[PDB]
A paper describes a structure:
Two conserved domains in LTTRs, the N-terminal DNA binding domain (DBD) and the C-terminal effector binding domain (EBD) are connected by a single linker helix (LH).
The crystal structure of YhaJ-DBD was determined at 1.76 Å resolution and refined to R-work and R-free values of 17.3 and 21.8%, respectively. The asymmetric unit contained a dimer of YhaJ-DBD’s. The YhaJ-DBD structure adopts a winged-helix-turn-helix fold typically seen in LTTR family proteins. Residues in the LH of one monomer interact with those of the other monomer mainly by hydrophobic interactions. In the YhaJ-DBD:DNA complex model, YhaJ-DBD interacts with the major groove of the target DNA. Positive residues (Arg33, Lys44, Arg56, and Arg60) of YhaJ-DBD interact with negative-charged phosphate groups in nucleotides.
Numbering used by the authors:
A (entry chain B): 5 to 57, 60 to 95
B (entry chain A): 2 to 57, 60 to 99
Write the structure that this text describes.
């Protein structure tokens, strides 16, 4: 869909690094790749997620940012757990 | 927060293969050609260095099954977050 783990990762990196350009540096992509992801999410959910000026998240943007970090942690834990089992097989 | 091989879409492919019983029927459900589902599965195997399906009917490996089952928990939480975000947007009378 447009809510992807990558979109949540983009949102997390923009919050942490402060801007599209700094977040794109972290993720190793060109900035337009990050804005494209965010445009598709904003258009699907039909809401503004943040305003750049550092970056300020909207109320809906902050809920996706904060609850999305819980999902990212769970995805990393699942990845870790599956690889650990795989080494035993 | 940066293990990027696993996607929710790959988990949804996994769920459809389990529910429908074959790559062919799952691909039919998802509106894709069956080899597109094979590619998504095999690219994840290669990125994670795991094997998801038994190589001796379509059967998940023990590793594939842990991703399938615990991945459904992730899918439910992603749907819940989508619903909650949409509900907040409505109470705020979001712009279209
Ligand atoms: Cl947070």
């Amino acid at each position: 869909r447009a809510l992807t783990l990558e979109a949540l990762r983009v949102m997390d990196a923009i919050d942490r690094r402060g801007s599209f350009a700094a977040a794109a540096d972290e993720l190793g992509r060109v900035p337009s790749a990050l804005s494209y992801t965010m445009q598709k999410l904003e258009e699907e959910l039909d809401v503004v997620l943040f305003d750049r000026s550092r970056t300020k998240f909207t109320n809906v943007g902050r809920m996706l940012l904060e609850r999305g970090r819980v999902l990212l942690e769970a995805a990393d834990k699942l990845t870790t757990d599956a690889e650990a089992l795989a080494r035993l097989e």
